[PDB]
């Protein structure tokens, strides 16, 4: 049997990226509702890290890349990474 092997995408808190931009990232790249995006945004602000979604490895890599691309082009240092789920 092929067991599941999925990967969670994380964002890390920083003191520079605006809250509104994080909500945007979550809505756009992780299909979060405004409320759910706000929820995750606040969790990351308070606790340092949060889960954006869980995907197959290649899809997780794609989302991490899209977030970093978007963040840097918007002049924000937002860190996005992935880990085995
Ligand atoms: Mg697990």
UniProtKB/Swiss-Prot annotation:
Highest rank taxon of the organism: Bacteria
Biological processes per GO annotation: protein catabolic process; proteolysis
Subunit structure: Binds to the N-terminal domain of the chaperone ClpA.
Function: Involved in the modulation of the specificity of the ClpAP-mediated ATP-dependent protein degradation.
Record-stated family: Belongs to the ClpS family.
Protein name: ATP-dependent Clp protease adapter protein ClpS
Source species of the chain: Caulobacter vibrioides (strain ATCC 19089 / CIP 103742 / CB 15) (Caulobacter crescentus)
Name of encoding gene: clpS
């Amino acid at each position: 049997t092929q067991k599941p092997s999925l990967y969670r995408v994380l964002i890390l808190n920083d003191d520079y990226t605006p809250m509104e931009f994080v909500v945007y990232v979550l809505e756009r790249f992780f299909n979060k509702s405004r409320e759910d995006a706000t929820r995750i945004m606040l969790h990351v602000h308070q606790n340092g890290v949060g889960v954006c979604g869980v995907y197959t490895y290649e899809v997780a890599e794609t989302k991490v890349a899209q977030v970093i691309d978007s963040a840097r082009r918007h002049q924000h240092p937002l860190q996005c990474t992935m880990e085995k789920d």
